[PDB]
Amino acid sequence: ANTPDRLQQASLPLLSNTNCKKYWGTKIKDAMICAGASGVSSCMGDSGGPLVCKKNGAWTLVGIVSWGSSTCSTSTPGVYARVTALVNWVQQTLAAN
Amino acid sequence: ANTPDRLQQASLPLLSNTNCKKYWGTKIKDAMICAGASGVSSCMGDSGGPLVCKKNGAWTLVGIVSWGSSTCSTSTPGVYARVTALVNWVQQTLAAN
Amino acid sequence: IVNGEEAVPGSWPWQVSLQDKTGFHFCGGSLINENWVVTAAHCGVTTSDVVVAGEFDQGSSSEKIQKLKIAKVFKNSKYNSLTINNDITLLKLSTAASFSQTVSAVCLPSASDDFAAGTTCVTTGWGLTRY
Amino acid sequence: IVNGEEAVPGSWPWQVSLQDKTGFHFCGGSLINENWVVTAAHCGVTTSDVVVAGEFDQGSSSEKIQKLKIAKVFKNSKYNSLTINNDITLLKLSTAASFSQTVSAVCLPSASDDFAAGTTCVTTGWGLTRY
Amino acid sequence: CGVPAIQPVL
Amino acid sequence: CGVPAIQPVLS
């Protein structure tokens, strides 16, 4: 099987939504963020996992594994839920519960 | 979770490579066959399973689940390994082992 | 399968479930013989995996299944991991499958038959029902 | 992750594994608090699924993990099951996770910060290493 | 081959 | 938040 028993990690660059559209076009919405196309790719089983960036020495959740290449091509960027675009809802939900 | 505990089935039409190319283009090779885009979709975990067609009262393996929509869109054809294209290799392998 | 339906138990007797050694289903396959299974090359099956035949429900704390060991994996040498072309692998079972009401083989076509566009076919599996 | 590498155990302390009732991993998630997990809405999580924290190896006979029950699922109402837009879900745990050296929370951004194109980021998970 | 003991229903 | 006790390596 191609399933890892141990937790995997990978380093990858963020793309602008413009660069991403070159690949996925109109499928890329405002609440989405792409990364990859650099020789690595999120694949089946990674959905829901994090995309983190270091800021002020701390790791910050920037994306949520959402969708990508059919084939998990390492030449195609993966699509992630843009946390920036959704954190107000997160913060409100926590505040109320 | 979206994982079924019970086996699922779906009826779907075979597509011509030409029509399939309308969707996937250049990605469709000779040893590939498409099916669906009719309101059903093979999804994560279906890989390697069968695509069967009735012939002379018996079920025949026409395809093997290979790849398809990123999001398992029911309006996008799934791609299958075309067994007609690969069965010579199967028969020669069985005949020798 | 998204927008499919539950199958009648044992009505797709060639349908197998491939499990890794943690016991989890990672791919589907088909019995073509008492001794062989055909699956996709992209599945990356190894001799460490197990073939489960005669299964309907994966939540069963017991059902009448056959856990079969793999003796040898026959990957098609033309499989392209970039293109995903020629996506086929053959599995030779260590222990043959006992054929029954619920375990039997699917037919194979010849290189020359034609399955015309428009033909109504069926696909089966334990894949997600929703993305 | 394709072309990734094994992480140092416990070095991504917010990483969680979501398991169904059968005991199988179907998605990842991240601890943001001792009481909440953020995941994707497309994962289709239910109060039936379990949150596993402090896990490294999914093949362990027994390891020091935390299997946390879910109290409530908060899917974002803006989630579009066709578009896959606004793909976020929050999980409120029945039992708070006990933070340690290996179980901890990730930071959340503000709606106003900018993570520029070209930034080198990191992704983690138990997803396939090859299609 | 291809003739299930339990016929497919659909 | 976001400061692992066990520092990650090469990621």
Instruction: Decide if A50 contacts D15 (C-beta within 8 A).
Output: yes
Give the number of residues written for chain E: 10
**Helices within B9-60 (DSSP H only):** 17-24
**Residue B22 DSSP class:** H
Q: Determine whether the interchain pair D5/F8 forms a contact, defined as Cβ–Cβ distance below 8 Å.
A: no
Q: What is the biggest distance separating any 2 CA atoms in chain B, rounded to whole angstroms?
A: 44
Q: Which CATH number fits domain A1-97: 2.40.10.10, 2.40.40.20, 3.40.50.720, 3.50.50.60?
A: 2.40.10.10
Q: Nearest Cβ partner of A1 from C44, C82, C84?
A: C44
Topology of the domain covering C1-131: Thrombin, subunit H (2.40.10)
- A13 token code pair: 């660059």
CA–CA separation, C59 and C95 (whole Å):
25
Angstroms from A61 CA to nearest CA on chain B: 23
Chains A and B touch (3+ CB pairs under 8 A): yes
Domain ranges of chain D: 1-131
C-alpha distances (whole Å) from B51 to each of B29, B54, D109, E4 are 18, 10, 46, 16
CA–CA separation, C45 and C39 (whole Å):
9
Residues of chain C contacting D85 with CB distance shorter than 8 Å: none
Instruction: Decide if C29 contacts B31 (C-beta within 8 A).
Output: no
Spatial CA neighbour of B67 closest among D3, C42, C90: C42
**Residue D106 DSSP class:** P
Q: Determine whether the interchain pair A59/F10 forms a contact, defined as Cβ–Cβ distance below 8 Å.
A: no
Judging by beta carbons within 10 Å of its beta carbon (0-12, 13-18, 19+), is residue B96 exposed, middle or buried?
A: exposed
Domain ranges of chain B: 1-97
Q: Under 8 Å CB-to-CB from A82, ≥6 apart: which residues?
A: A30, A31, A32, A33, A62, A63
CA–CA separation, D72 and D56 (whole Å):
26
Instruction: Decide if D48 contacts D60 (C-beta within 8 A).
Output: no
- A82 token code pair: 């843009």
Q: Nearest Cβ partner of D13 from F5, F10, F11?
A: F5
Resolution to one decimal, Å: 1.7
Q: What is the biggest distance separating any 2 CA atoms in chain F, rounded to whole angstroms?
A: 20
Residues of chain D contacting C42 with CB distance shorter than 8 Å: 130-131
User: How many C-beta atoms surround the C-beta of residue C47 within 10 A?
Assistant: 13
Q: What share of chain A is helix, strand, coil (3-state, %, to 5)?
A: 25, 35, 40
- D61 token code pair: 């006979």
Q: Under 8 Å CB-to-CB from D68, ≥6 apart: which residues?
A: D50, D51, D52, D53, D93, D94, D95, D97
Name the experimental technique. X-ray
Helix and strand numbers (H, E) in chain C are 0, 8
CA–CA separation, D86 and D89 (whole Å):
9
Q: Under 8 Å CB-to-CB from C29, ≥6 apart: which residues?
A: B48, B49, C15, C16, C17, C18, C37, C38, C39, C43, C51, C91
CA–CA separation, A67 and A87 (whole Å):
19
β-sheet bridge partners, residue C30: C15, C38
**Which H, E and C letters describe C77-124, residue by residue?**
CCCCCCCCCCCCEEEEECCCCCCCCCCCCCECCCCCCCCCCCCEEEEE
Instruction: Decide if D45 contacts D72 (C-beta within 8 A).
Output: no
Q: Determine whether the interchain pair C26/A5 forms a contact, defined as Cβ–Cβ distance below 8 Å.
A: no
Spatial CA neighbour of A63 closest among A76, A46, A75: A46
- Judge whether C113 counts as a catalytic residue: no
Q: Please name the amino acid found at residue C52.
A: V
User: How many C-beta atoms surround the C-beta of residue C92 within 10 A?
Assistant: 17
**Residue B14 DSSP class:** B
Instruction: Decide if D125 contacts D1 (C-beta within 8 A).
Output: yes
Residues of chain B contacting D48 with CB distance shorter than 8 Å: 1
- Which residues of D are part of the catalytic machinery? 42, 87
CA–CA separation, C99 and C83 (whole Å):
36
